[PDB]
Amino acid sequence: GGNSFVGLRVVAKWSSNGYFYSGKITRDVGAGKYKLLFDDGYECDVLGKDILLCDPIPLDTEVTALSEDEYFSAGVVKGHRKESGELYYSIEKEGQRKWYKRMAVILSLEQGNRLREQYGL
């Protein structure tokens, strides 16, 4: 129903760059679209096909992990932990794991497109 997805966490495409970002559905607005509040505080309407109802991003998913500066790279989700309700992902790269905060994990277009079958609205 209309309220079923309100407050659910998603990973959804930002049209401008093809990447899928963490956020929550805030409203079913019709015409196949939902109002999203992204974790960066942007609120806008996104097509269901561009929303992965996927939280946490599961084990063995290839993601883009963001570091300090201009450093980002592909890695594989190998773990999850909470620290005061904020989520961290354990990302494996070249046999070495590091913890990343939720907003330091995004999906390239290709990485998000892989999950549409299983998680897309």
Ligand SMILES: CN1CCN(c2ccnc(C(=O)N3CCC[C@H](C(=O)Nc4cccc(-c5ccc(C(N)=O)cc5)c4)C3)c2)CC1
């Ligand atoms: C939902 N929002 C809407 C606004 N969005 C953009 C607007 C304009 N321009 C860009 C962009 O493509 N550029 C080029 C590249 C360098 C910059 C940039 O996006 N830098 C940046 C660096 C580190 C982390 C993030 C980040 C991580 C997570 C989230 C999240 N989960 O919400 C949002 C942003 C962004 C800017 C992105 C980001 C997504």
